[PDB]
Point group: C2
Chain length 459, copies 2
């Protein structure tokens, strides 16, 4: 009935159909510009309980306010108190400050609202995604039978590559269709091999697909975080001696805490020797394929599958991930948002070389930051960097450092002074920088170390 | 290292830090306005081979062009040749024209780039998501113990609801942790009961979680698309009598073709009698909770789990879905996506702006209009109505005294698409090719439908 009133809530084609659209989006842009301009820390420091109370009090039933005012309210309450990856002291996790071409692509994705499940919901988008996927297969130097699909991120990609592996091995061993029949009777013997430092989405993937955490067999890691190749075949051979069936092996290209890259070529050799599927978790370090350091990923091009997550080191907005396969017939076992537009635009604008130069810069800078910590007597460096993470702690001659560094991390977060990672290294609490922003200077790091020390002094 | 030239590629905080950002976004908003203004059909009608060739020819290596020109190029090649859900003649699928508040929300989501997996990556966002979840649990009248989480949409929500059911039943029967141990030895007996018209993500869900398509036990559907509850008790009793373990049942609130709503209350009573998990797939008709037709979902409040797709009839941009559970203790099975986006902002903004009553009013409208369109087809000798509508879909076909109708209706559907005249659904109804309207846009008029049927007839006359 009052359809004329409803027209303002929607975009329409033809003359004047998008005037309100342009007005509203111009308004949202200015609102966000004002937020960014007034940000002076990674977090506002607002009491999380007070923030929670104010959000909980918001009226979602009888407010019915003009959209521009709802945008102002969200700017003020939501945006102002968010975590600003764009601030130099937000430096904890694989949580990327977004690239401009991805933020622009999102504006077009939203307005078009294409659905990737069929051509007639995603005409030009279907071809864009395939073009990006084709280009990706070329960058990782995959075979002529290679293909890929965009997913929600590294988690869904890991789960998909491993679920492909699950169906692949059952078909191999006994021509058994898991898709039609469920898991085969020997499923309880199947085992996925991975490092102690691989992402927990390996165990989670195994649970989801019905094998359970018990299906995951770990191999000891080295001290730099890499899988220990001198133990690998032994773990596989002992399993087989016990009647177990190692069917998949996960090589990690960029561990979450160390940024370690497994020996992919040796892992690929093991996959050949023992007839396993190699899945490469390239969520973090897969971006190095564009850099001067591509050689560290040698063996990746031999993978059965590879998870690539663009919303980490490619700086794309969440979600943006792909799963690649060396042989697209493996997609037979399996027989949605336009996130590929982000990568399509990025590569035309910033381009792959620039991205690689950024990563070269990040690796060098991370070495420099380790050196800064090493020579600073209020800190202790806890590992030598492998990629763009730094592992370190505040130090004191009498204080209980586990206690100090846990308190430190949470205080810095709560006050909005810095957003720092926290892990265990060698049995000790470590703080973590995950350096992603390629525009930080040594003075940023110097100021960051000083903020952290000033907090340590008070605890 | 050219850190000063890289600066242009990123937003920064403080004075002048977001100047380029504003300029680029304003450019992009302008480019989309131009696109929308020049759009005059659901699809441009460009030869798909030509469009694919042009897209494949794009340089992703050595172009390295200024961002505004790349934006111009994508507007020209990608946007201009997209499927426009905003055009009245785009009317095939559960593919929604986006609500303005969802589009504005995406701008803020993209700029903040919060990651929902932890508070220190999503500080205000975590509470926004929980607020919206709590609100949803109210709207569906769930228990004091209810909770939910946002997902990528109906597929992920279906898979998660049924995976929870899978772990729930192993825990109940033998205290067996599927999380820790994998499927129990009796897994081969487990069965999920659904109708012949349920979404195929039930079978796909079963395949993903290790049970296989053979785990799905289908029950006959009535002609109107609803589950036939006539033999449902006996089908379950017989399965159990054979040593099978029916552990979950899917009630569909809005089937894909008919828009039929299963008798969710009786399914819930089956689940009490037979000790099963009832999962409600409300990806389509879950939205009716806000309308005058809420009564049709009676029984939804008793579900063990409910999937809700906001990017369908709630008009949110893809992705925007959630899975609700009546007892949050059931989430314990999940506890050992990661990186997930702040989609809940869309609903949070939409309910402040449009609000639930206005959406309810839109749905009342859509149900009435669908009946009106069915009537219009009924009294038009050029078409044959193939089902009485149940929600916002209409099933019909072009008719002719001698022509092969299966052939005619197939050809006109594909031709309407490739010429960009209309985006129409196609299905099978009583073994006959049917065309389909999925009416979603609440702003369409009688004259839109008259002209749409006229456009279709003219295609038919030529075929």
């Amino acid at each position: 009935a009052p359809q004329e009133e409803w027209k303002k809530h929607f975009i329409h084609t033809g003359e004047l159909g998008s005037a309100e659209f342009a007005s509203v989006m111009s308004h949202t842009t200015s609102a966000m510009k004002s937020v960014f301009e007034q940000v002076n820390a990674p977090y506002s420091g607002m009491d999380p309980k007070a923030l929670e109370d104010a959000i909980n009090a918001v009226d979602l039933d009888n407010k019915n306010a003009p959209l521009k005012s709802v945008i102002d309210d969200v700017a003020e309450l939501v945006a102002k108190n968010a975590i600003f990856t764009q601030h130099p002291d937000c430096i904890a996790h694989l949580h990327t400050p977004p690239l401009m071409p991805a933020v622009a692509a999102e504006a077009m994705i939203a307005a078009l609202n294409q659905s990737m499940d069929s051509w007639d919901q995603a005409s030009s988008a279907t071809y864009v995604e395939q073009k990006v996927v084709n280009w990706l297969c070329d960058k990782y130097d995959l075979s002529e039978k290679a293909d890929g699909i965009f997913t929600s991120g590294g988690t869904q990609s890991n789960q998909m590559g491993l679920m492909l592996a699950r169906d692949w091995i059952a078909d191999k061993l006994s021509g058994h269709s898991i898709q039609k029949l469920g898991l085969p009777d020997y499923a309880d013997k199947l085992r996925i091999v991975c490092s102690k430092k691989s992402h927990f989405t390996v165990q989670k993937s195994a649970s989801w697909m019905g094998l359970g955490e018990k299906a995951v067999m770990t191999v000891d890691a080295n001290a730099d975080g890499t899988m220990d190749i001198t133990k690998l075949d032994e773990v596989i051979a002992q399993a087989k001696a016990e009647g177990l069936i190692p069917f998949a092996i996960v090589g990690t290209a960029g561990t979450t805490d160390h940024g370690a890259i497994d020996d992919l070529d040796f892992i690929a050799d093991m996959a050949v020797k023992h007839d396993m599927w190699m899945h490469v978790d390239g969520a973090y370090g897969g971006a190095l394929i564009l850099s001067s350091h591509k050689s560290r990923l040698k063996g990746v091009e031999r993978a059965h599958s590879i998870s690539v997550d663009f919303h980490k080191l490619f700086y794309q907005t969440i979600s943006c991930g792909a799963l690649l396969v060396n042989d697209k017939s493996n997609f037979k076992f399996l027989l949605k948002r336009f996130d590929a537009l982000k990568v399509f635009m990025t590569m035309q604008n910033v381009g792959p070389k620039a991205l690689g130069d950024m990563y070269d810069h990040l690796l060098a800078q991370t070495l420099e930051v380790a050196d800064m910590i090493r020579t600073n007597d209020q800190f202790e460096l806890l590992a030598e960097p492998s990629l763009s993470t730094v592992l370190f702690r505040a130090t004191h001659e009498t204080a209980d450092l586990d206690e100090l560094n846990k308190a430190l991390r949470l205080e810095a977060l709560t006050r909005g002074i810095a957003v720092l990672g926290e892990t265990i290294v060698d049995g000790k609490t470590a703080l973590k920088f995950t350096i992603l922003n390629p525009c930080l200077t040594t003075s940023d790091f110097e100021s960051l170390l000083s903020k952290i020390n000033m907090l340590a002094v008070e605890l």
